[PDB]
Nucleic acid binder design. Structure first.
Lengths: 79, 138
RNA sequence: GGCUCCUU
């Protein structure tokens, strides 16, 4: 099926990568599959990562909605 | 030899993904090679050796790092810093690098590229202490 | 190939 690509950005890279960890664990615990992350070069003090979710279940979405990411971590999506 | 800079980037990406996902390093290595379109035997084989070395010695590498973290557990480090340090230790110590200064330069470049200068200073500072204790004890 | 940028 169709992959979800997530781009995460922040001004704190440890909190950024921890947020990536939490997303990955949540996906895997619900039977989904990821690819990446791809860390991107830091630019003007802003850190970013890309993560693909290449398989997911309706439970994955439910689990993903119930997590709370640290303030300061911005998330963007595309199909 | 400059192709090793690229090989260190490949190996770092694999360790970083392994830390985050916990999947088979062999499969993670295949993913990174395809994404970066690695096609030269020199860089492919050196990257594979760095990854194989870090993975096979991961417990001792983490202990060596922790000995110089002044009481912190290694889970305190950022994902970028912890895996750049694992890679640095694998090459400097377990592969007994004959070009240590170049290892340092590429490791800190990676940290500066995917994290920041503050992280680069910390990694350089820790790796330097690890290396001097190794040289001393040898 | 610029053979450590030095404990967040």
């Amino acid at each position: 099926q169709e992959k979800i690509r997530i781009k995460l950005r922040a001004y704190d890279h440890r909190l950024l990568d921890q947020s990536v960890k939490q997303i990955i664990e949540t996906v895997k615990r619900t039977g989904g599959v990821v690819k990446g992350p791809i860390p991107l070069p830091t630019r003007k003090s802003e850190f970013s990562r890309i993560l693909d979710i290449i398989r997911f279940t309706p439970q994955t979405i439910e689990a993903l909605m119930e997590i709370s990411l640290p303030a300061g971590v911005d998330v963007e999506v595309k199909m | 030899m400059r192709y090793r800079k690229g090989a260190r980037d490949t190996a770092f990406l694999v360790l970083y993904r392994w830390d985050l996902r916990g999947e088979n390093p062999g499969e993670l290595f295949k993913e990174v090679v395809e994404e970066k379109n690695i096609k030269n035997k020199d860089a492919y084989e050196y990257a594979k050796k760095l990854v194989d070395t870090a993975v096979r010695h991961i417990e001792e590498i983490d202990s060596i790092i922790e000995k110089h973290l002044k009481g912190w557990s290694i889970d305190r480090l950022g994902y970028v810093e912890r895996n750049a340090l694992r890679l640095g230790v694998a090459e400097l110590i377990f592969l007994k690098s004959k070009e240590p200064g170049r290892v340092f330069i590429d490791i800190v470049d990676l940290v500066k590229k995917y994290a920041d200068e503050k992280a680069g200073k910390f990694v350089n500072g820790v790796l330097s202490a690890i290396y001097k204790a190794y040289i001393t004890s040898s």
